[PDB]
Each structure stands twice: as structure tokens, then as C-alpha cells.
Amino acid sequence: SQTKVTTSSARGEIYDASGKPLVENTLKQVVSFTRSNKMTATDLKEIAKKLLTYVSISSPNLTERQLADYYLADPEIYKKTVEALPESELYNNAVDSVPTSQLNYTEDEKKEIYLFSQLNAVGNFATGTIATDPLNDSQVAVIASISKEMPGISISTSWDRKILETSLSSIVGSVSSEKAGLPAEEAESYLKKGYSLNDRVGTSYLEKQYEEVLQGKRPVKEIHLDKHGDMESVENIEEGSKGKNIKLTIDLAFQDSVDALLKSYFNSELGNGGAKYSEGVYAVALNPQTGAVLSMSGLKHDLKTGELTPDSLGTVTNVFVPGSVVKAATISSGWENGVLSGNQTLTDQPIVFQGSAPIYSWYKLAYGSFPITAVEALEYSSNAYVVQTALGIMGQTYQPNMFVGTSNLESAMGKLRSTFGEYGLGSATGIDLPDESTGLVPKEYNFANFITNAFGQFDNYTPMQLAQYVATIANNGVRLAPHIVEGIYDNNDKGGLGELIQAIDTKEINKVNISESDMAILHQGFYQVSHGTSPLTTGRAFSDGATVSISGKTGTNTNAVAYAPTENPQIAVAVVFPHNTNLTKNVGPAIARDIINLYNQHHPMN
């Protein structure tokens, strides 16, 4: 006979881009129980109550199955209760349901019952921790001195997993405690996949996403038995090792300095009143060549208490009206659906349809009606250009005061949203976290909604989606999954960050369906937004004190997207600052610029 047993190892750890740890495996001293196939329930009760002399059990919360187990532990009682009923394993379960768990146990009794439950829970030949009230150093060394009196019992060392205080703590996630073994919701997934029931696993964010990587490789043994089933031999099969480590793409120092910037700007805008009803401000920076996440920062402003709190996860979980940043995706949809040809000229004019208020741009009537190319539409943030484009996806040509036919409305809204999805606006980003919001995208809508969607006043998107969108433009239409993890690494001698096992490779999701020369038109528009010399140029704030050439688009909402350097992009950034009523200066582009300059300082680009 041979019975094989699996024990757990140490979890791999999480490091920022410069090698600073984000978590900690901390060593404790613990009462351990190693169970033998030969211990009766009575042998367990004798061990539990010898142990109670040495430990403290103050908070005893017994489940009725635990109470029925302890009760049945008496051999005679177990017989008598089966005798009294209407496959041994089936009869245990049957006898179990038969006893009224309103038995009478003194409070001291309850404590041995608690201890028993702990011992009983341990598999044959397995080793599990016996939870007790914390043990000081002397209490421990008395147990160490008489533990030989108690079969199976010994002192040894275990782990707690701790998250260090850092600006990336929210994103690290948590791990299940030794006490609360596996999560019960997924209990079946994990036993199946291979795990034991007391395993410590990732339950949120990175710890969960990279659980397969972080989980220690287990020691495995086979115990050899004599003809009676008595342990004879301990033959090992696999020796265990610490889990592997992941190194993030984010540098703490960079992330810290973005957090400070957002906090600096948001308080200023509260200072002058512009941010009074704003829910907060969010920024995500990405490397457009690889999808690497440079930082994901968020500051939440509570509209009831006024309090400000860090909200990095807001970047992947909360949604916002995106405003005018999205105008390049609408033009793209115009090219895809045969509405627009190259850098086509349209008339900028108010758009007047039967049944709705006339549509204007930020400049209203100030320059009358005038011709405008696709580049200039982006430069000026023309609503006329994109509203005429959308009507054209619906198969129609604009004439003032037209009654609009809606037979092609669903078809049209689908084509628009499909292009938007090509840029990650309204679709999954691919980011390496368990659960991202994919936006607020209403399945019920009318014609006015379709039209407003075209200039970014209908569907709501997350800040991560808005970064992937500008990064896609910056990477010439090849949209890349954002990834917070940079590589998986081995452990070194001492157990810290060792050497590269495997880098996380760049992942292409799709290629936007527009020609190379169309994409060059978008690039010229974003460039003129920040370099133009018209009274209608919207984005010169991008270039004001810019240390590299910046291209971008401006966004009630003060949103902004940008990349740099223009000629060879190494950073793409989205800034989302909702319901800022400041009409005298727009801080969106200035935040975007200052994040770009911060990065250039930190990782020179040129």
C-alpha cells in the first residue's frame, strides 16, 4: 500500500518595475497537527484535551456538523445512533442528520470540541495548522517542550501574506487566509484543478489573475504501509519550491508622481469652484508599442462628504461620457462605410433635423458656415463634420430641415459602435485583471442618441478604454492589450526577485480597418490640434512647455488624449475629468502634457 500526500509551498511575490516589493511573506510560529490513518475519533479527543491545557480558545463558534461529529465520536454512541435509524460512509451521513444539534455543552467542553474539529479536519498523513488564540514566545516554548506527549502535534512555522503600503496596493489584490481555506463559491474549480482544501489562493486583482504563476509548487510524498496499514516508509516524489514572481510594468515613483499631479490639479479646480460636482479625475498612461501599463491613477471625489480618496481601480471599473476625444473614431467609421473619401471637405454649418434642436460646435455662429477638411475637423473639434458623417452611415445626405428616415438606424448605430469597438471604446480591452467594465452602452436608443454618440455624448467608457483608443492611433491602427505585468521571474538564492523566466509578450487584438493614408490623416489632425495657428485651434495647451512633440485631442467634461513623441510614439495617455464647469481654462490637455513631461524626465524619449 501507498498513500500519496501533497503539502503547500510559499507564494511567489509581486515587484514594481524597479524591483521594489509590493507584498510580503511573513513567517509565524504555529501549532501543527500531522494525522495518522490509525487515530480513532477517541484518540483525537484525548489529543484535543491534552492540548487545551497549553492553549487558549476564547471565541468558539461551532457548526452543527462539528457538533454531530464530536457527539458521534463515542464508539458506543455511534453504534446506538445507527441502531436507531430507519455503506459505512452513507451511514455516517445518515446518522449525522439524526441527532438534534441542541445538545448541552459546558463552555469548557465547547473548547475541546473546537480543538477536535481542527484535528479531525486534517487528512490522513497530511499536516494542517491548529488555529488558537495567538501564542506568545513562552507559551510556544512550553508546547515545544512537551509536544512529544501528544501524537502528531508539534510547533512549526507558517505564513501570512501582507500587502505593503504603496500606491499600487489596491491593484495587487488579496489572498485567502489559511483559516478561510478556499473560497466556497469556487470550491469545486480548485479541488478539480488540483488544489487541496486549505490552500491559500488569490481572490482579487493581480493575485487572482496570476494565481497559476504565484502558487508554490508543492512537495509530494508517498507513504508506504505494512500489511496492516501501519506507516512504514516516507518516499518523496517531488520537492517543493516557492512560487514564481511577477514584475510589473509600473514604476512606483512614476505612479506616485502622477497621483500627486492629479491631486494637485483636482484641488486647484476645487479651489476655483470648477470641480465642485466632479466625481474625481483619472489618468492612464500606456506604452503604445507594447501595451505596457505606465500608470493607472485615479482620485475619487465623494459628492456627499467631499472627501478625496485614491481610486486607481476606477480606471478599469467606472465609466464616463467621453466627449470630443472620440471624433477620430467617428471619422474612421466614415471611411469604413463608404461615406468619406480621404481628407474630404464638408461644410461646417449648424445641423438642423426635423424633431431636434439645431446642433452647433463650441464656436457657434462666430465664423458663419465654412469649408472644413477631416484634418481641420479634428483641429477645431467640429461637430458638423462628424454629425454629417454619421448621417451618411445611415445612408443619407444632409440638407437643412430634412425629415430623417429611421429604417437604417439599428444598422447605423451598429456600424458606428463596431468602429468604436475597434479602438476599444465599448469593448473589452484585454487588460490582465479578472473583471473590467466594458462601458455603459445602451441597447435601447433612438435617432438623437445615435447622433450624440457620434461626438461622444451617449455611450460611457472607462479611462483604460480611452487610453487604449489613443494608443491604437499611436500604434498605427494595431490595438494592443494593456498589461500591468512585465514578466515572470525566478527566485534567487535568498528568495527575492531572481532571473527572467518569461516576458509577457505583446498581444495584438485587431487592426483598425482603414488605409495607411487615412491613418496619416488622423495623425495630422491630432498634430494640428496641438500645433495649429487658427483662432479655432483647440489644443495649443498641449505644446506649452512640452519637452517633446505632443499630438492629441481635447474633450461638462474636460477630457483629453495624447501621445508622444509625435514621430515615434513611446507614451499614449488619457485624462478623464468629468463635470468640470471651468469655461475659462481647460486643464485636461495640461494634465496630459504634464504627465508626458513627467515620463520624459523619468525615461527620456527625444
Indicate which residues carry an active-site annotation.
324
Q: Is 567 in the site for Zn ion (CB under 5 A)?
A: no
Contact set for Zn ion, span 287-346 (CB under 5 A): none
What 3-state class would DSSP assign to 501?
Answer: strand
CB 258 within 8 A of CB 426: no
- Nearest distance from residue 217's CB to Zn ion, in Å? 33
How far apart, in whole angstroms, are the C-alpha atoms of residue 313 and residue 300? 10
How many residues touch Zn ion under the rule CB under 5 A: the total is 6
Shortest CB 230 distance to Zn ion, Å: 3
Q: How many angstroms separate the CA atoms of 487 and 507, rounded? A: 14
Minimum CB distance to Zn ion smaller for 252 or for 413: 252
Residue 94 in the binding site for Zn ion (CB under 5 A): no
**From the CB of 254, what's the least distance to Zn ion, in Å?**
6
Q: 182-221 mask for Zn ion (x: CB under 5 A)?
A: ----------------------------------------
Which one of residues 4, 80, 224, 602 is an interface residue with Zn ion (CB under 5 A)?
602
Show the CA angle centred on residue 598, arms to residues 538 and 169, nearest 5°: 115
**Alpha helix segments (H runs only) across 381-476:** 383-393, 409-422, 447-453, 463-474
Nearer Cβ to Zn ion (203/460): 460
In the structure grid, which three cell numbers stand for residue 410, read together? 439599428
CB 33 within 8 A of CB 128: yes
Query: Closest separation between CB of residue 92 and Zn ion, Å?
Result: 25
CB atoms within 10 A of CB 482: 29
User: Which one, 392 or 578, has the nearer CB to Zn ion?
Assistant: 578
Q: Answer yes or no whether residue 605 interacts with Zn ion by CB under 5 A.
A: no
Neighbours of 136 (CB within 10 A): 8
Burial zone of 547 (CB within 10 Å; 0-12 exposed, 13-18 middle, 19+ buried): middle
Task: Rule CB under 5 A: say whether 230 interacts with Zn ion.
Answer: yes
In the complex, least distance from residue 324 CB atom to Zn ion, rounded to whole angstroms: 15
State yes or no: residue 603 binds Zn ion (CB under 5 A). Answer: no
Q: Least distance (Å) from Zn ion to the CB of residue 122?
A: 22
Residues 6+ apart with CB under 8 A from 399: none
Task: Give the nearest distance from C-beta 343 to Zn ion in angstroms.
Answer: 33
User: 3-state class of 596 per DSSP?
Assistant: helix
Residue 148 touching Zn ion (CB under 5 A): no
Q: Which is nearer to Zn ion, 334 or 578 (CB)?
A: 578
Q: Which residues inside 462-491 make contact with Zn ion, applying CB under 5 A?
A: none
Interface of this chain with Zn ion, residues 242 to 281, rule: CB under 5 A? 253
Window contacting Zn ion (CB under 5 A); options: 209-217, 228-236, 365-373, 500-508: 228-236
| Options 64, 226, 302, 410; binder of Zn ion; rule CB under 5 A | 226
Specify the stretch interacting with Zn ion by CB under 5 A; choose among 97-105, 369-377, 430-438, 570-578.
570-578
- The nearer residue to Zn ion, 40 or 101, going by C-beta atoms, is 40
DSSP H stretches of helix in 487-580: 516-531
Q: b or e along 86-117 (b: 16 or more beta carbons within 10 Å of the residue's beta carbon)?
A: eeeeeeeeebbeebeeeeeeeeeebbbbbbbb
Q: Is 57 or 250 the residue whose CB approaches Zn ion more closely? A: 250
Q: Which is nearer to Zn ion, 243 or 578 (CB)?
A: 578
What are residue 202's DSSP bridge partners? 175
Helices (H), 84-210: 88-97, 107-120, 137-146, 169-172, 187-193, 205-209
Residue from 148, 228, 364, 494 binding Zn ion (CB under 5 A): 228
Nearer to Zn ion by Cβ, of 179 and 228: the residue is: 228
Stretch that binds Zn ion, among 52-60, 226-234, 311-319, 475-483 (CB under 5 A): 226-234
- H or E stretch including 510? strand 508-511
In angstroms, give the least distance from the CB of 226 to Zn ion: 4
Neighbours of 398 (CB within 10 A): 18
Positions that interact with Zn ion (CB under 5 A): 226, 228, 230, 253, 578, 602
